[PDB]
Design a protein around this ligand. Structure first.
Ligand SMILES: CC(C)CCC[C@@H](C)[C@H]1CC[C@H]2[C@@H]3[C@H](O)C=C4C[C@@H](O)CC[C@]4(C)[C@H]3CC[C@]12C
Ligand SMILES: *[C@@H]1O[C@H](CO)[C@@H](O[C@@H]2O[C@H](CO)[C@@H](O)[C@H](O)[C@H]2NC(C)=O)[C@H](O)[C@H]1NC(C)=O
Ligand SMILES: CCCCCc1cc(O)c2c(c1)OC(C)(C)[C@@H]1CCC(C)=C[C@@H]21
Ligand SMILES: [Ca+2]
Ligand SMILES: [Ca+2]
Ligand code: NA
Ligand SMILES: [Zn+2]
Ligand SMILES: [Zn+2]
Length: 770
């Protein structure tokens, strides 16, 4: 009936007993003491223990394990941890009975990466962690850039569509229930998928501290509890801890991210970090523990003034439910009728509607029943609401909020912070930006844990660590290619078309892609390009070619515009045919290697082979022809040549994964020719642009995209203007990681380079965001 001698144990006395309350009567005395505040005065040094004080400055406190964190500094002349110089920590300096260096996760809500430039005058402790440890210039959250999806992504390594927490608010039709940030419903385990770090640790024998705190527990008491847990005996001491602060999120919403008011919470956060680090040094654990300082998302300038209203677009908005704000999700209280009515209606429309299946694949935001079919992507700095009355402002007439977040995760104001400090991290080291889905694997490596299956790429962050790295193994190739010669006569071919090799390894710079599923396919060589041609899908899985800086673009001759040629290397039974296209009134065809870039009049005939052809809507051909005729030459001219790999993607169930043949739902009329949902291109060059793409020594440079194969250009409100005004903007919107294309294709890229595999894993997880 009492919490005596079991405050914050690992009637309830735990961190959450207050949350939907359940604490023993005496919890607020024994466990939430507060007298004297949280720091030692030189006036109470050597005091006589008063059991009402929050923390203690008696000399028995080091033996009783309850000093204030500044006790050695004020009462024994030691320095603050922040006043010591960086000293490289080569090994963990831990007590003898420690089996692994502990991990402390210090998570900050809404910490914009830019905040790191307010400097040591605002955040000396944080700036010391950043400069002496390992830090990225920023870390990319997942979409939507909201608190709960992103904190749970950090804990699991999973996209929201997979771990289930797809928003701060969501409706689950199978439960017929709603989930919100406030309320008891979030406490029900039915909402939460994947396997969070605290569960991974416990299942593998690694004790976790309680990661969560009832809101009425002050930040100073949370830090004190973590330090007192670290002083437990060997068989009780947890190995992993978490501290969370709702700041600077609250102030960023109220005053906006550029408000002078922002330095107040930024200082209070930095003092809490100082309290942690002084406490660790007091325990002489400051060279033993790995510390992670990480944010969930950034913060953007948003105001009531900048709101789009559905009631300006729909005739009746009272018959729909809208999840509003920095994103939109719509359900009923006709779907493409609603989409049509929201599509390009106002000149500078500050949101775009999507069926979720048509969102950029890099968002990975569709494969979950809690994600509504209709999605609105909202311009940064802007809000979307159902109707004007939903915008609440102070009686002062001023807006209630000046900052918000939730936008597309390539928005620079949404990027957040990563710093790692301690024995396992590198010393005074800066690493490139990375996505937060990669962090779960790192924390597992820091703890000696085997990660649960997740969406990180294990080994892509090895450069963050000085030890305990994961050694990735390149996957074995599963399908071996055929190399067909001339096996067939031009006379054997029906098809209904008409038409008036190791030099070729200037076109395959990084080895052939490995095919990681079982299938039959052929390598085909040509003067200008190489392809892996699938006998099952009747088209290339990949087409690879190199365009040098000085390449010339030619046209498609008038006498060749409608030319398709049979390929004598490939059976007529394993080729496409032109009858299907003539009979498919909506489908045209295009070519993966562009005829525009042929090296000679004779070579160009290769580009018209039936094995180079892929099904394309006319509306998509406007995009593809512009990319092939205009943009490839541009990139090659900018990057001292480029190597391009292009191919189809089939993802009819929108799970981000290569469809089997059973899942493909659309074929060219009267044929077995499957229709791709997307087309990809990977564009590689030398990071050192003074070396040409085909003669690159060191690191590589990549940009990639996954373009939706649509029968219209309704996504592009300016598509009626010249293609130079919209096509490249559409391509930047559909940028992707090479790793994204690998999931969607079953291919494995960059297998023959002079780079280490871990370096290559990093390359494949880069996303060019512009
Ligand atoms: C807002 C504050 C009161 C804190 C609210 C905390 C609440 C969101 C936390 C507290 C308990 C957590 C669950 C607990 O760890 C058990 C698991 C098992 C794991 O496999 C899936 C996640 C789950 C359900 C945790 C979800 C988050 C919880 C509810
Ligand atoms: C993200 O990672 C999860 C976990 O590995 C993947 O989800 C698994 O997908 C397989 C194959 O479809 C299923 O058999 C498992 O049941 C899934 N597990 C979970 C926890 O959902 C998911 O496919 C990955 N997403 C991407 C885009 O790669
Ligand atoms: C690795 C970065 C931190 C991960 C650990 C971590 C800590 C943490 O306190 C939370 C995490 C995850 O996610 C959920 C479960 C969404 C919590 C929601 C409610 C509150 C108050 C805090 C959140
Ligand atoms: Ca046609
Ligand atoms: Ca799929
Ligand atoms: Na439940
Ligand atoms: Zn947040
Ligand atoms: Zn917020």
């Amino acid at each position: 009936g009492s919490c005596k001698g079991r405050c914050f144990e690992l009637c309830r006395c735990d961190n959450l007993c207050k949350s939907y309350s359940s604490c023993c009567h005496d919890f607020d005395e024994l466990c939430l003491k507060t007298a004297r505040g949280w720091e030692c005065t030189k006036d109470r040094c050597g005091e006589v223990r008063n059991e009402e004080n929050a923390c203690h400055c008696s000399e028995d406190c080091l033996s009783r394990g309850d000093c204030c964190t500044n006790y050695q500094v004020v009462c024994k002349g030691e320095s603050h941890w922040v006043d010591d110089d960086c000293e490289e920590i080569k090994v963990p300096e831990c007590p003898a009975g420690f089996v692994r260096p502990p991990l402390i996760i210090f998570s900050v809500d809404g910490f914009r990466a830019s905040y790191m430039k307010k400097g040591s005058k605002v955040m000396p402790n944080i700036e010391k962690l950043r400069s002496c440890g390992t830090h990225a210039p920023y870390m990319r959250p997942v979409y939507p850039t909201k608190t709960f999806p992103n904190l749970y992504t950090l804990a699991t390594g999973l996209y929201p569509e997979s771990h289930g927490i797809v928003g701060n608010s969501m409706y689950d039709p199978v439960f017929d229930a709603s989930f919100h940030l406030r309320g008891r419903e979030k406490f029900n385990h039915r909402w939460w998928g994947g396997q969070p770090l605290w569960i991974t640790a416990t299942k593998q024998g690694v004790r976790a501290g309680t990661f969560f705190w009832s809101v009425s527990i002050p930040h100073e008491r949370r830090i004190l509890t973590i330090l007192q847990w670290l002083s437990l005996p060997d068989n009780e001491r947890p190995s992993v801890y978490a501290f969370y602060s709702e700041q600077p999120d609250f102030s960023g919403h109220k005053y906006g991210p550029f408000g002078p008011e922002m330095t107040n919470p930024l200082r209070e956060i930095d003092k809490t970090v100082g309290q942690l680090m002084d406490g660790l040094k007091q325990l002489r654990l400051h060279r033993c523990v790995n510390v992670i300082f990480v944010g969930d998302h950034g913060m953007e300038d948003v105001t009531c003034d900048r709101t789009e209203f559905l009631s300006n677009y729909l005739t009746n908005v009272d018959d729909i439910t809208l999840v509003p704000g920095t994103l939109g999700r719509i359900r009923a209280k006709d779907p493409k009728t609603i989409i049509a009515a929201l599509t390009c209606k106002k000149p500078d429309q500050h949101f775009k509607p999507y069926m979720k299946q048509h969102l950029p694949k890099r968002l990975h935001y569709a494969n979950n029943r809690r994600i509504e079919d209709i999605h609105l992507l909202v311009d940064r700095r802007w809000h979307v609401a159902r109707k004007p009355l939903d915008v609440y402002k102070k009686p002062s007439g001023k807006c209630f909020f000046q900052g918000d977040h939730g936008f597309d995760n390539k928005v620079n104001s949404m990027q957040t912070v990563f710093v790692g400090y301690g024995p396992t991290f590198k010393y005074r080291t800066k690493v490139p930006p990375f996505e937060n889905i990669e962090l779960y694997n790192v924390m597992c490596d820091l703890l000696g844990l085997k990660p649960a299956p997740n969406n990180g790429t294990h080994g892509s962050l090895n450069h963050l660590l000085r030890t305990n790295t994961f050694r990735p193994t390149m996957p074995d190739e599963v399908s071996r290619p055929n190399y067909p010669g001339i096996m067939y006569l031009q006379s054997e071919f029906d098809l209904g078309c008409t038409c008036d090799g190791s030099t070729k390894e200037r076109h395959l710079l990084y080895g052939r892609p490995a095919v990681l599923y079982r299938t039959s396919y052929d390598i085909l060589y040509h003067t200008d390009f190489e392809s892996g041609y699938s006998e099952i899908f009747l088209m290339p899985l990949w087409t690879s070619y190199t365009i040098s800086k000085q390449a010339e673009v030619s046209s498609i001759p008038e006498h060749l515009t409608n030319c398709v040629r049979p390929d004598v290397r490939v059976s007529p039974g394993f080729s496409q045919n032109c009858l299907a296209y003539k009979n498919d009134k909506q489908m045209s065809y295009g070519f993966l290697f562009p005829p525009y870039l042929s090296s000679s009049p004779e070579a160009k005939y290769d580009a018209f082979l039936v094995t180079n052809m892929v099904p394309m809507y006319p509306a998509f051909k406007r995009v593809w022809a512009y990319f092939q005729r205009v943009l490839v030459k541009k990139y090659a001219s900018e990057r001292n040549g480029v190597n391009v790999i292009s191919g189809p993607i089939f993802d009819y169930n929108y799970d981000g994964l290569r469809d089997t043949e059973d899942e493909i739902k659309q074929y060219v009329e009267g044929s077995s020719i499957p229709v791709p949902t997307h087309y990809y291109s990977i564009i590689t060059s030398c990071l050192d642009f003074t070396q040409p793409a085909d003669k690159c020594d060191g690191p590589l440079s990549v940009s990639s995209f996954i373009l939706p194969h649509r029968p219209d250009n309704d996504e592009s409100c300016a598509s009626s203007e010249d293609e130079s005004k919209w096509v490249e903007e559409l391509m930047k919107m559909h940028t992707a990681r090479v790793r994204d294309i690998e999931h969607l294709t079953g291919l494995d890229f960059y297998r023959k380079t002079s780079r280490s595999y871990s370096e290559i894993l990093t390359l494949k997880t880069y996303l060019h965001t512009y």
